[PDB]
Amino acid sequence: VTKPTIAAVGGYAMNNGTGTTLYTKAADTRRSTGSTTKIMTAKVVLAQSNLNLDAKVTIQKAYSDYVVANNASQAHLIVGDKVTVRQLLYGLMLPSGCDAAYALADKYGSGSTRAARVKSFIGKMNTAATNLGLHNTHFDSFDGIGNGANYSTPRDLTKIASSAMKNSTFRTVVKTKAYTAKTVTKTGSIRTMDTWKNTNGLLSSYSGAIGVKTGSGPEAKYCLVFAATRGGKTVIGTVLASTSIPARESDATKIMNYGFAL
């Protein structure tokens, strides 16, 4: 059809299976990523050699005080509770839990203090980007809150998502609309947390939708990394700095419809 007009200042889409570019709009112009940064955190974790999805992590007061201070989005994890790595991945990706991101960084970074392990974890995120051969991506935080040193591009981010989608656990989490965690309490009892719902509205509005993660920030504005399959063909892409929640959703709908019609 005809190229669609979108509100996002940055946009990109490709055939996930072949790598062929389908849509472009300032595809290689660097911008702030906000919470879309959490896609890489999940990717690094899932690639750890010492990965055990059933391993349990104790929620520290630090994770809790962190979201309060930066008034970040959270999964409402309760300090004292024991949560598995698998549950933390759902907490990170669905409601966009920055408290979960912190817990994952602290667990998989290497070092003797929490401060040292987060530093090491962020170093791992950048190494992963270099290994993907990226040139316009740099991380300064494990969640996207950090600073102006936290940037990427619509093309770079799409390649990061495509790489993560190669992991079945990642694909499973990302297409999940709702998840309810049953955690272990400080005294040993089982707690049913309030249900977590995925912030990505395409999972319900766009048929074939299968991913992947919304994002936002004071500088990043409204972002979304999307993916969908139809006729055995899957297009994956990114939209950076759209003007609102609904606008970001139609931007992506428009790009995907165009990509499938090419």
From Swiss-Prot:
Catalysed reactions listed for this entry: Preferential cleavage: (Ac)2-L-Lys-D-Ala-|-D-Ala. Also transpeptidation of peptidyl-alanyl moieties that are N-acyl substituents of D-alanine
Active site residues of this protein: 35 (acyl-ester intermediate), 38 (proton acceptor), 96
Keywords in alphabetical order: Carboxypeptidase, Cell shape, Cell wall biogenesis/degradation, Hydrolase, Peptidoglycan synthesis, Protease, Secreted, Signal
Binding site for substrate: 213
EC number(s) per entry: 3.4.16.4
Pfam families: Peptidase_S11 (PF00768)
GO biological process, one term: peptidoglycan biosynthetic process
InterPro entries found in the cross-reference section: Beta-lactam/transpept-like (IPR012338), Peptidase_S11 (IPR018044), Peptidase_S11_N (IPR001967)
Membership in a protein family: Belongs to the peptidase S11 family.
Protein name as it appears in the record: D-alanyl-D-alanine carboxypeptidase
Species, as recorded: Streptomyces sp. (strain K15)
